[PDB]
Design a binder for this molecule. Structure first.
Ligand SMILES: *[C@@H]1O[C@H](CO)[C@@H](O[C@@H]2O[C@H](CO)[C@@H](O)[C@H](O)[C@H]2NC(C)=O)[C@H](O)[C@H]1NC(C)=O
Ligand SMILES: *[C@@H]1O[C@H](CO)[C@@H](O[C@@H]2O[C@H](CO)[C@@H](O)[C@H](O)[C@H]2NC(C)=O)[C@H](O)[C@H]1NC(C)=O
Ligand SMILES: *[C@@H]1O[C@H](CO)[C@@H](O[C@@H]2O[C@H](CO)[C@@H](O)[C@H](O)[C@H]2NC(C)=O)[C@H](O)[C@H]1NC(C)=O
Ligand SMILES: *[C@@H]1O[C@H](CO)[C@@H](O)[C@H](O)[C@H]1NC(C)=O
Ligand SMILES: *[C@@H]1O[C@H](CO)[C@@H](O)[C@H](O)[C@H]1NC(C)=O
Ligand SMILES: *[C@@H]1O[C@H](CO)[C@@H](O)[C@H](O)[C@H]1NC(C)=O
Lengths: 170, 321, 321, 170, 321, 170
């Protein structure tokens, strides 16, 4: 991937993460389990839905062929008419195939960007209070509460709390 | 040590999409945007049945080819359907002047009302019923186009015709008339008496003078003679005036243009499907929320945009592991 | 502990732009690229005034409809302006042969110079001034197109005309002439004496033979007769030859094609604005450094490219906080 | 953002940074204040100006409609002519709207990329002689001179100098 | 301390490419996709030689202009090549009816076989060899188009012609005939005796009546008279019938349409190059694996797609240091 | 660059790295030298080859002009025919120039993305057993074997081995 998160340093996707697209899997003494990150997942949904619509309502202005008939002494304009309509047909065909192709590719790297952004959001919060295995996971130099976990997800994780147990636990 | 991980979705979906750099990429969620199916019927278009011309051409219908009596009186249509090569066109051989321009005007018409403008019985100085050809048989006897009258001399003479018709209707009238080109000068006199003949026609915008051209032609439908047909649109409160001393194929019935709107003349081998649709192609109707279809480029109605692709699929999800 | 931060710009700008994934995104700097305004005048185009035809058609002008004397002598133009349905066209009813092909040739012409090719006084064997119709009144009396001569028999006879004109000019000449179609054969003889008449015309490239077709037509501008007009381009050092024993509407004045270049025939209800411009549309002129405009697709000059958008705005800055 | 700098881990833009687009705000004992980073800001300007021009001079070749007139017996070609010109008009309209739309989106992520690149330029220079709050800021494990600050901006910041005071100040 | 580095490629390549944000970017590997060269010859197209018409028009060739004897019998061609303004066209001045429609039908024809349909010697009641004009000289003597016969009266009379030809071949026939328009009525009678003359022609689909129009015309190639030529396609087992009492330019030779396929009529000043090609333009042939070329838009064969660019180059490598 | 690797924090490309596009240059006691990273380099080649083909086989449907001839009384349709063919010619010209221009730009950042991805692959493996000069290089807090080097390239580099000598070598 261009951002290297999906099929990258996070080599595999989660079958068991059915809530949303990207998210978390905590694991502490009080049990583990998958939680979707609803904020990034809804950011991504707003975006993709708007992209489909965009694509559709840009092809609203598209050539609509009409049938005309010519006599056997009108062969030149019958030909011009044919070439003219075939031409608009190929143009607008190229346009749809090439737009789908380019926005498809853009769509993936968007998801790649989002997982990476999410992975960096946690990382930039935990600082040195956690280890970076580099495989998509962070291990806390302290113990983490099921309410401390959600605090990293929420974006409130308190650094000047465990700032002690982590620093003295190395 | 407690641990938190950032991870993404994956499932047992197998649908592939293409990108610029990579084709057949299996994605977790996609959206197909190409409609590829239809019913295979010609359907009423939002409750309005098409006019399906069966084995008759548009010429066969508007002139009243005796093989085309199913269309002697046609209801309003959404669109008209005509075969590639209808068997019943011009029974007596000839040409239809500016035919394609008329078929174009039809794509814009939804309903006619045939009316009698010059009664066949109103020709006391000529023969109005005589009239007929083996090239145009009806039920095993000699017949002719029903909307026009092949006038022949009476008691050995053809007095010059000065006939006018004034359109006292609210609507435009499609008027049709013609001229017969005989194979020899002796057939000419046999039929019309006058060896030198003409047909003049005038309205506020029209001014034509026809002369029958005689030539030796191959037989078509058993005839070496030819019929040549002409039409015009007569505006309300305008009149058409005729003048001829021979070879005149007079109008009897004309067409009131009662409904105008969006129409089309569709070329299709199919016939009425007994269904309803909001989008019809020559191959069958489409019912789809899809923004693209690849069925046929000449469609009628509220249709998805036509592309020539085999497949168009939008990746909505992420790569699938 | 001293601290350094990486940060970006933001301001109190409120202009939005669209993207594929997001519309109405407020950006710190944008560039609008669509010109959406005009003056509402028809202006001289780089110092060259348009020819504004007022209530006259191009036909009215080139034939010399008496209602069109404002254009008896027209200066060089940048472009020509003609209304949708000019009131003054063919005062005496009829047709103008290959009219649209002539209007097309005009889009490529910047200046005419009317010249007298056959003086009205040079018709000693016919009546040159008689000439006139109530369908073409001027100041409450019967008049006629000024550039052509409706020749009538003299002292009860119409000798056959053999007239030629040789283009001894440097430039091509637009030449116009015509034929009158009477309503009866008794009007024919009243006017031209000869019951059977023709008009032959020839040049190095032209070879035509006209016969007046008589028919009974509706009255238009009070007339059942018709005038039919024809034109050609006569190359320098070529001649035109006429021959007629009746129904001939002779040329008097022709047009020297003095300037050729880029022109256009613009359809507009507007009239001269008394301004200057480098880009004109049917709705008014444009003065803009903008690379796109959405005013009207048929423009003339150094113009921005026409799109059908409501708004086209380029984000140049970054998201605004 | 796709690079996650703008409206990301740098949640807000600076009203007071009027010099340029991206840049710095130092704060040491000798006073604080905003400085634009003129090298990245001029990189971005070269780029956007070229992009506008590109867009304009690619639409130089665009269909220019001409008026033609047809008689009432020419309805078929009058129609073909109409459809033909309407068609080129819709094609080139789609083209401009879709190019502006795609380059708009590309333009933003460019600015996003640039802030991130800039934020990484400093970061890769300071190494362990500074703390990463993760909010767009770096705090020096040593004291920084107004001439040491400009040295990070310039790209000359000397690591084997404060390499001591920072390492022993933890 | 041992050290590992991540690094990329660079070399001494200097080829630049453009991007949206940056032009003249030196890249380590590029792929030029525009073919910009040709040979400058008109070549056989996959082993089939073109028909190069030299100084003759298509009209000059099909009528048999005596200056065009090199094409009296032409082999199968891939495409036809005709100059902008060929010197040899209609030696005797006149017109060729629906000429462009015929040239269009040629683009679809690969081979003719000239056949004699009406022998020049089979005209016992008229003069078949007399026949000739100074406007059409051959080797310093008066000549005429070779494929048609200018029939003149014999021993002071011109009996009415009734001639038919039946196409007993497997293939369609291109048939050509004409009418002579004299400058006066005294030339008319000198040539054809009958002052009032016609030419009627008929087939299963054709029905025409020609009348020679007399006018006073400028001299072209020394002649004030005109020849007007007509053609049709005669289907196997159909016949053509002629009838005339004057002014008839009879067919002698016609053309069997032996091969139909993909062809073209190319406008070029060049002549045969003695080479082979799979892609030809008016300027010279192209031999290229390139997916685009910018030589000329009207090409024939297996060709790269034509664009108007100066340069099209695809970056395949990375920025070069 | 948008990913900031090429002409970025790796300011220069290697003349001596002739094997492939991106790759390595180890330097330990047993000798140094350039090795291409064949996996990323083949990833990039698969991609670019497919992109060329794509571009070519999308312009397969392109308008092919035909010669038609008109008389001097056919000027209007001769003109319409001219405008119609010129129009399709400009459209498909814009299309090729604009696609090459956009995919060119995309192509570079792809290479940029790949070098960065590669640079992050090593980095995420070595963790604290190496120093990050930030110039494209990593220095091991332990000594590295020519077979330990290839182990980082391969993606197998063993962290729980040198995990000692590196931690105690600071
Ligand atoms: C056709 O008949 C109508 C109605 O009789 C004629 O109408 C002329 O002008 C107005 C139209 O609304 C009528 O009120 C007048 O009474 C009519 N004029 C005359 C002199 O009768 C119309 O003129 C007729 N058309 C033709 C060609 O004769
Ligand atoms: C029109 O008049 C010109 C000039 O008198 C005629 O010119 C012919 O050929 C050249 C043209 O430059 C002149 O120098 C000759 O003197 C002219 N020939 C003759 C026999 O006079 C031109 O022929 C005239 N056009 C017509 C149709 O008669
Ligand atoms: C041209 O000649 C053919 C062959 O003689 C004529 O063919 C007619 O119909 C079929 C066609 O296969 C022949 O087998 C018949 O013998 C022909 N009919 C007659 C009555 O002879 C064809 O009719 C001729 N064309 C014309 C216009 O006369
Ligand atoms: C398509 O038509 C079928 C048959 O009437 C109907 O059951 C179905 O709901 C329709 N679907 C849509 C999307 O119109
Ligand atoms: C537009 O025209 C006005 C009036 O002459 C003039 O003042 C103004 O400078 C012009 N601007 C441009 C961009 O041409
Ligand atoms: C081009 O033609 C030349 C001359 O025959 C030949 O030598 C060369 O191999 C050809 N190249 C291609 C790509 O066809």
């Amino acid at each position: 991937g261009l951002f290297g998160a999906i099929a990258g340093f996070i080599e595999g996707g989660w079958q068991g993460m059915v809530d949303g697209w990207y998210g978390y899997h905590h694991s502490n003494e009080q049990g583990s389990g998958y939680a979707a990150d609803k904020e990034s997942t809804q950011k991504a949904i707003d975006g993709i839905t708007n992209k489909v619509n965009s694509i559709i309502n840009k092809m609203n202005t598209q050539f609509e062929a009409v049938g005309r008939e010519f006599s056997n002494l009108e062969r030149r304009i019958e030909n011009l008419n044919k070439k003219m309509e075939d031409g608009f047909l190929d143009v607008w065909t190229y346009n749809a195939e090439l737009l789908v192709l380019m926005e498809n590719e853009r769509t993936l790297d968007f998801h790649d960007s989002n997982v990476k952004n999410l992975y960096d959001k946690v990382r930039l919060q935990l600082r040195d209070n956690a280890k970076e295995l580099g495989n998509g996971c962070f291990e806390f130099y302290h113990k983490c509460d099921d309410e401390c976990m959600e605090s990293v997800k929420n974006g409130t994780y308190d650094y000047p709390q465990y700032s002690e147990e982590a620093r003295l636990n190395r | 040590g407690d641990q938190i991980c950032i991870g993404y979705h994956a499932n047992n979906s197998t649908v592939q999409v293409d990108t610029i750099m990579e084709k057949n990429v299996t994605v977790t969620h996609a959206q197909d945007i190409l409609e590829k199916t239809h019913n295979g019927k010609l359907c009423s278009l939002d409750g309005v049945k098409p006019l399906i011309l069966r084995d008759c051409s548009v010429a066969g219908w508007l002139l009243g080819n005796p093989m085309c009596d199913e269309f002697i009186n046609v209801p309003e249509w959404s669109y008209i359907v005509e075969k590639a090569s209808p068997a019943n066109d011009l029974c007596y051989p000839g040409d239809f002047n500016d035919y394609e321009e008329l078929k174009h005007l039809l794509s814009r018409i939804n309903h006619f009302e045939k009316i009698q403008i010059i009664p066949k019985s109103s020709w006391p100085n000529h023969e109005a019923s005589l009239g007929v050809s083996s090239a145009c048989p009806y039920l095993g006897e000699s017949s002719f186009f029903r909307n026009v009258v092949w006038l022949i001399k009476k008691n050995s003479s053809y007095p010059t015709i000065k006939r006018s018709y004034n359109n006292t209707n609210q609507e435009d009238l499609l008027v049709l008339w013609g001229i017969h080109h005989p194979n020899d000068a002796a057939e000419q006199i046999k039929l019309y008496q006058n060896p030198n003949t003409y047909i003049s026609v005038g309205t506020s915008t029209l001014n034509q003078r026809l002369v029958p051209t005689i030539a030796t032609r191959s037989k078509v439908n058993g005839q070496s003679g030819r019929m040549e047909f002409f039409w015009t649109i007569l505006k309300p409160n305008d009149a058409i005036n005729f003048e001829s001393n021979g070879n005149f194929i007079a109008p009897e019935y004309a067409y009131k243009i009662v409904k105008k709107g969006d129409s089309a003349i569709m070329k299709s081998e199919l016939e009425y499907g007994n269904c309803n649709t909001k989008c019809q192609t020559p191959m069958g109707a489409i019912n789809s929320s899809m923004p693209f279809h690849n069925i046929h480029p000449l469609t009628i109605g509220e249709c998805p945009k036509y592309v020539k692709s085999n497949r168009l699929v939008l990746a909505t999800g992420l790569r699938n592991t």
